[PDB]
Write a protein that binds this DNA or RNA. Structure first.
Ligand SMILES: O=P(O)(O)O[C@H]1[C@H](OP(=O)(O)O)[C@H](OP(=O)(O)O)[C@H](OP(=O)(O)O)[C@@H](OP(=O)(O)O)[C@H]1OP(=O)(O)O
Lengths: 84, 496, 764
DNA sequence: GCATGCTCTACTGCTTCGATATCG
DNA sequence: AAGCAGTAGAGCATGC
């Protein structure tokens, strides 16, 4: 689930159809964050925490690599609203 | 609406019969459509660059649409015009562009007009902005497509009904078609007498390059009569002195904007200085008057924003040479107060009887000192094809103060003999023309548009706009045939 | 009525005025009208499709609900949904929108050619992991339709129809372990229907092996024996009592048994207190909102129309706030009383009447239903029950079938079992030992596969079963393949005593293998590897060049010798330089040629991880691991079988979160794999128990370095060293791979705690 | 002293225009 | 500094 959503999120960043890649990216971010919030078993919670704050994929490297782009600001807004 | 963009799809029949033009000292219809589309791009890139355009090729072998239909090539989506979108269309120009076009597009294929109208409807559907008008320009030379069939014909008429239900209106730019263009075989019922080329392609090749702004209101004021009888107006502007767009500072190695930041800091300690620890001064010889940034904006406030009527006045006291500001245009807005239009219309058609004009104090913004302004009424002028040139309302004429006028030195009155007046009346009658309103054109602005076009499309050299505000010295001379020498002999002494 | 036309045109005229100005109101009004009158949406359908790619919210859900009404009366609909990106609106995470998308697919499936159903099917089968049972239920509905309508209706359907059936069958199999009691029951009654699994027991036992799918291996034996004992419940001797005469004559009362999760056991009460298409299981018994306010006519249910309404909105809001206080106080009870009602809610299957003597008048149901009921829980008893049923049914096959059909029954069973053993990745010990136990009993199945059998019971620690199967196959030219795989089975449980009398010179093997085994028997592994690798490059054999299985034996035993010493450089070179041809080695070729997974992969991971754990900074294993986590199968293999390797690897990059997840996964995998080994397989359970100390040392290190008080002083470090220097595997009994794990892990932990900590170094 | 929607207010972005300070 | 479209959530009604 997660890490599949994160790898498809990093794939929707080098794509060719920008503003068509961002809508898919926003849906990936939303479902990902929904799964991460609705977990309560502390074994999978550490896995999801380490995947979200990962350094190869991960939401922080997503908002870093998608920061020279105006099509991705809804994605960055939803990531920063998920992280709070 | 207002924020709604204008969308336009260019549909070009690049099938078979636009590539073997019958003259060879003339221009093939594929090149005619390509030149037309490129002129519309260059016109709209600085006329109204928020509009959306697209070009689609059907009757071509290879396809690049979203549904992967047979023989529809979408070269560009609906998007704002750019330099690269004109440079991509540059390749299919001239007698060589056909050959550049064949090897990567296709040609002569079977098609279905239902599927090309389907792809155009999908292009209009995939747009996330709001659109005012949606149009499809059809560049075609064959009338009666799908002439071997009728299932294709009725499906095409059905899908045009599907298009016109959603608000999309196509129009055909018919090309030559030796044998006339019979508009009634297929293209009188699909769209909203034999022909030659057209009456729209030729004036569509005329690049206008003049910016067009939408009808915003610039002010929404309340016109008060004493304190009680308030009506709502809008203060529009109909002449506005078009400027050139301002430059953008770039970074020379990258050509990206550079995010200017200005700060104030004191040279004593080099500490960042807020807006709260400065004041404003004026030095008069030795006195120093020191107000604050709040108190310098208190000096200007006199009234509340709006128009305070102060009586009425015949137009004979409104001198034509009393001009300081370009006039505005008031108009009743019947949504901030109800019956505003009725009181406006009664006041309008009752100041239209005599030559009376309402006098006002005009405060456009908040902390703005008042101006005396003269609300001259005006009727409307229109024709039977409902083109109106003067809208109804008042024209808001700014009147100068005592210190806006200036005095002249003493000048002797040296009148003329009626021989001189009658021989100058012939001179002014010889040179008479008709001033329309918009015959002339800003040369500095036009040359800026031409230079920007030629530097973004990197063509070969900047085109020069032919000047129009310049006088024609030889034509004025030959018009005034052998008259000015005897006139200056009769009014000017034989010397110098 | 006549007044249809002038009214529907009036409603359509108002909606036509809506659809250009405010589309937000146009689709709300159209949705409300075509909740009840769907033929109005026929004239607005292209203008619904036009507006559909614009809205992104609830309004697109309303647009799709308008589409859903007119799906049968629409001709193409796939090209319109494909232009409007239907596959990407199905992946929008919203349960109402996904339910209406799947309902649109379900209504438009009988008008789809296979080439577009195959494009729709790839996002449909992603709903296995969906949290809502409603979307999963709709997915199973459309896959059941695909299974019923794509079972080859003609002579040979195309590749598209065959792949469609294969994908639907995979997900329909996988829905037999679905985590919802009733979705699993729907799928189980789907499979247990007469038209899919037959009613003949000899042909149901053959059709059962079609629905295997390596995902469901922990559950396959209980599922198979459930499908097989279905047919007892429709026999004319099933409710009949099994013995018609009691022991003596006594009357029997009715005994109801109190089984409620409040007095679960006798121990939790101090003393005396102040009191003196079908969802059906054959085992546990036989068991939007509208704005119009007018959305019974009797003699008792119309006195509640005598109602008062308090006009004290302040007091009413106070009562509602106090009500919500009471609900918040009762949730605190319910979210504990439901976690207690989960682990003591037992069901009873029999009838239980009591008398003066034991009542030997049980039905056949009173023995069959607790038998299947416990086979559903315990996998060992499911293994025994499946072995008994399979052997009994093939024994009673003899009177029906003659010889021409028995042989191509057993050929099909041999093909099926070879498929099982060649595609299993989770080498579940009851499953592997079950299908290698039912193969020994029947002589037509003794020709199973020598290398699959050897790899299977080496990976599941079930080596006695494979030894018995291979020896019974060598009973009944020497079969050097079976001799070498039997020797590879014997070598891994020790047993060099048996290994001496195998590699004589009558089976064709060389002398170098016997000399290397004789050296390896006295634990002289360096002299064993010295001649194993010597025999692996020698091409001048003066009595025949050796067969391939013998060279594979030399390769595996030389890797074992390098693992047994400590030689990690030779181990990674020997495991690595046989999967790649050139000098740069491509580690991701290890996942093809399935020999490589059971042969080179554990030594590859182990050698590279040991070199990482002591010093060297070659980051070539982490790249392989992160690249292998992309696959849905390789991730299952890695986090099921290694996970302690993975926990240490993620500890090496200071990722103590993923290491927490992987060590908890490793402990759960230990418990599940340990308790499924049969109880008289000692030294299989001993080697499964030898690995728990390294798991708990990793867990203890994670728990030590997580608390911040432990890094403060040297008191908790001195206590940790004081317990680590008294906690060892035993000398003479635990081998050197256990010792090397404990000591290398402990040295790496001490180096990490040292570099994190601020005479500590002399102590460590 | 709580839970759920609904209305509608207040804010942002973009764009035009006008007032002010500055430069050849 | 103001028009003008677009939206998000603040504040409040309401619940029997
Ligand atoms: O007598 P007034 O009504 O006060 O106006 C007169 C005069 O008006 P007449 O043309 O009827 O004589 C001029 O009005 P305009 O030419 O501006 O339309 C004006 O001229 P200037 O304002 O340009 O100075 C100036 O007369 P003069 O030019 O002699 O100063 C002025 O008389 P006042 O100066 O007394 O206001």
């Amino acid at each position: 689930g997660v890490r599949c959503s994160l790898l498809r999120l990093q794939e929707t960043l080098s794509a060719a159809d920008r503003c068509g890649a961002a809508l898919a990216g926003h849906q990936l971010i939303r479902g990902l964050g929904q799964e991460c919030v609705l977990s309560s078993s502390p074994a999978v919670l550490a896995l999801q925490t380490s995947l979200v704050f990962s350094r190869d994929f991960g939401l922080l490297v997503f908002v870093r690599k998608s920061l020279n782009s105006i099509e991705f600001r809804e994605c960055r807004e939803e990531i920063l609203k998920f992280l709070c | 609406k207002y924020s709604g963009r204008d969308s336009l799809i260019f549909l070009v029949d690049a099938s078979k019969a636009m590539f073997e033009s019958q003259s060879e000292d003339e221009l093939t219809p594929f090149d005619m459509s390509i030149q037309c589309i490129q002129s519309v791009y260059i016109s709209k890139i600085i006329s109204s660059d928020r509009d959306l355009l697209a070009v689609v090729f059907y009757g071509t072998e290879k396809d690049k649409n979203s549904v992967n239909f047979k023989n529809i090539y979408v070269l560009q989506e609906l998007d704002n015009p750019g330099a690269k979108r004109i440079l991509e269309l540059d390749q299919f120009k001239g007698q060589q562009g056909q050959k550049r076009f064949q090897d990567m597009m296709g040609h002569g294929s079977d098609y279905s007009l239902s599927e090309v109208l389907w792809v155009c409807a999908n292009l209009f559907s995939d747009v996330q902005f709001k659109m005012s008008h949606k149009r499809i320009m059809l560049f075609t030379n064959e009338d009666n497509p799908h002439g071997n069939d009728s299932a294709k014909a009725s499906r095409a008429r059905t899908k045009a009904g599907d298009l016109r239900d959603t608000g999309i209106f196509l129009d055909l730019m018919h090309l030559k078609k030796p044998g006339g263009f019979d508009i009634s075989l297929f293209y009188r019922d699909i769209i909203s007498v034999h022909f030659e080329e057209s009456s729209k392609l030729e004036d569509l090749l005329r690049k206008v390059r003049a910016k067009e702004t939408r009808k915003r209101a610039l002010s929404r004021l309340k016109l008060k009569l004493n304190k009680d009888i308030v009506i709502s107006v809008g203060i529009y502007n109909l002449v506005q002195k078009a400027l050139k767009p301002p430059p953008i500072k770039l970074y020379r190695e990258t050509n990206e904007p550079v995010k200017t930041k200005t700060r104030t800091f004191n040279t004593s300690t080099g500490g960042l200085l807020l807006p709260s620890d400065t004041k404003r001064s004026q030095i008069y010889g030795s006195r120093q008057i020191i107000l604050e940034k709040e108190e310098t904006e208190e000096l200007k406030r006199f009234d509340d924003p709006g128009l305070m009527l102060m009586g009425f006045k015949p137009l004979v006291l409104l001198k034509k040479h009393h001009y300081l500001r370009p006039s505005l245009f008031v108009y009743p807005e019947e949504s901030l107060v109800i019956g505003s239009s009725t009181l406006f219309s009664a006041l309008l058609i009752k100041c239209l009887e005599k030559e009376v004009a309402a006098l006002c104090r005009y405060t456009p913004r908040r902390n703005i000192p008042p101006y005396f302004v003269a609300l001259v009424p005006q009727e409307e002028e229109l024709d039977d094809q409902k083109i109106q040139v003067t809208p109804p309302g008042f024209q808001l004429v700014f009147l100068p103060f005592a210190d806006d006028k200036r005095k002249m030195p003493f000048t002797e009155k040296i009148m003329a003999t009626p021989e001189q007046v009658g021989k100058m009346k012939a001179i002014v009658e010889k040179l008479r023309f008709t001033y329309r309103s918009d015959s002339f054109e800003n040369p500095v602005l036009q040359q800026h548009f031409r230079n920007l076009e030629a530097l973004a499309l990197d063509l070969m050299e900047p085109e020069q706009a032919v000047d129009l505000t310049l006088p024609k010295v030889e034509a004025m001379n030959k018009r005034l045939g052998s008259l000015v020498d005897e006139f200056k002999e009769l009014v000017y002494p034989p010397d110098y | 009525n006549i007044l249809e036309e002038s009214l529907c045109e009036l409603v359509a005229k108002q909606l036509k005025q809506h659809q250009n100005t405010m589309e937000d109101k146009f689709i709300v009004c159209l949705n409300k009208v075509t909740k009840s009158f769907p033929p109005l949406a026929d004239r607005f359908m292209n203008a619904v499709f036009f507006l559909l790619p614009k809205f992104h919210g609830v309004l697109k859900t309303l647009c799709l609900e308008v589409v859903l009404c007119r799906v049968e009366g629409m001709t193409e609909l796939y090209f319109q949904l494909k232009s409007k990106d239907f596959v990407q609106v199905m992946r929008h995470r919203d349960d109402e929108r996904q339910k209406v998308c799947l309902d649109i697919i379900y209504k438009m499936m009988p008008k789809l050619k296979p080439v577009e159903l195959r494009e729709l099917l790839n996002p449909v089968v992603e709903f296995v992991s969906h949290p809502s049972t409603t979307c999963r239920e709709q997915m199973y509905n459309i896959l059941m339709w695909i299974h019923d309508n794509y079972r080859d209706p003609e002579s040979e359907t195309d590749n598209d129809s065959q792949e469609i059936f294969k994908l639907a069958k995979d997900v329909l199999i996988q829905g037999l372990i679905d985590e919802n009691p009733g979705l699993q029951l729907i799928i189980r009654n789907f499979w247990s229907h007469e038209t899919r699994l037959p009613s003949n027991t000899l042909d149901r036992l053959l059709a059962l092996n079609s629905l295997y799918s390596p995902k469901i291996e922990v559950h396959f034996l209980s599922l198979a024996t459930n499908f097989l004992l279905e047919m007892t419940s429709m026999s004319p001797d099933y409710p009949n009592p099994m013995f018609e005469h009691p022991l003596s004559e006594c009357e029997f009362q009715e005994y109801t048994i109190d089984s409620d999760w409040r007095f679960r056991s006798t121990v939790l009460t101090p003393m005396f207190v102040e009191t003196q298409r079908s969802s059906f299981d054959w085992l546990t018994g036989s068991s939007s909102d509208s704005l119009l306010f007018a959305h019974a006519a009797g003699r008792t249910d119309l006195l509640r129309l005598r109602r008062r309404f308090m006009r004290d909105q302040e007091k009413l809001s106070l009562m509602y706030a106090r009500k919500g206080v009471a609900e918040q106080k009762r949730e605190k009870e319910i979210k504990s009383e439901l976690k207690m009602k989960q682990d003591a809610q037992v069901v009873l299957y029999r009838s239980y009447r009591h008398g003066d003597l034991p009542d030997i008048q049980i039905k056949h149901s009173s023995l069959i239903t607790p038998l299947q009921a416990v086979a559903q829980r315990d996998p060992i008893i499911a293994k025994q029950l499946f072995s008994s049923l399979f052997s009994g049914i093939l024994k009673e096959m003899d009177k029906f079938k003659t010889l021409s059909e028995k042989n191509n029954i057993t050929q099909k069973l041999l093909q099926d079992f070879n498929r099982f053993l060649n595609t299993t990745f989770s080498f579940f010990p009851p499953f592997v030992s079950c299908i290698q136990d039912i193969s020994c009993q029947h002589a037509a199945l003794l020709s199973l596969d020598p290398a699959a059998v050897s790899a299977g019971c080496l990976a599941s620690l079930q080596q006695p079963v494979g030894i018995r199967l291979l020896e019974e196959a060598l009973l009944r030219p020497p079969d050097v393949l079976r001799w070498v795989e039997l020797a590879k089975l014997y070598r891994s449980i020790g047993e060099y005593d048996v290994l001496r009398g195998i590699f004589t010179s009558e089976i064709g093997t060389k002398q170098i293998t016997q000399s290397a085994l004789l050296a390896e028997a006295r634990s002289d592994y360096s002299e064993a590897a010295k001649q194993y690798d010597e025999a692996l490059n020698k091409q001048d054999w003066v009595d025949g060049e050796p067969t391939e299985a013998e060279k594979d034996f030399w390769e595996l035993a030389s890797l074992d010798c390098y693992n047994h010493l400590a030689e990690w450089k030779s181990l990674e070179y020997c495991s690595t330089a046989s999967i790649d041809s050139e000098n740069p080695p491509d580690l991701n070729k290890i996942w093809s040629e399935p020999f490589y997974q059971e042969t080179y992969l554990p030594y590859m991971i182990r050698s590279k991880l040991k070199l990482l754990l002591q010093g060297e900074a070659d980051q070539s294993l982490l790249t392989f691991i992160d690249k292998a986590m992309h696959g849905e199968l390789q991730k299952a293999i890695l986090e099921l079988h290694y996970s302690q390797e993975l926990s240490l690897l993620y500890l090496l990059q200071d990722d103590v979160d993923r290491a927490k997840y992987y060590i908890q996964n490793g402990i759960q995998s230990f418990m599940q794999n340990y308790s499924s080994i049969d109880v008289l397989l000692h030294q299989s359970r001993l080697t499964k128990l030898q690995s728990v100390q390294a798991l708990t040392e990793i867990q203890e290190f994670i728990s030590f370095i997580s608390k911040q008080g432990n890094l403060s002083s040297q008191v908790p470090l001195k206590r940790l060293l004081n317990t680590w220097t008294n906690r060892y595997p035993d000398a003479k009994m635990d081998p050197m791979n256990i010792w090397d794990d404990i000591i290398t892990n402990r040295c790496f932990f001490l180096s990490k705690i040292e570099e994190k900590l601020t005479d500590i170094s002399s102590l460590i």
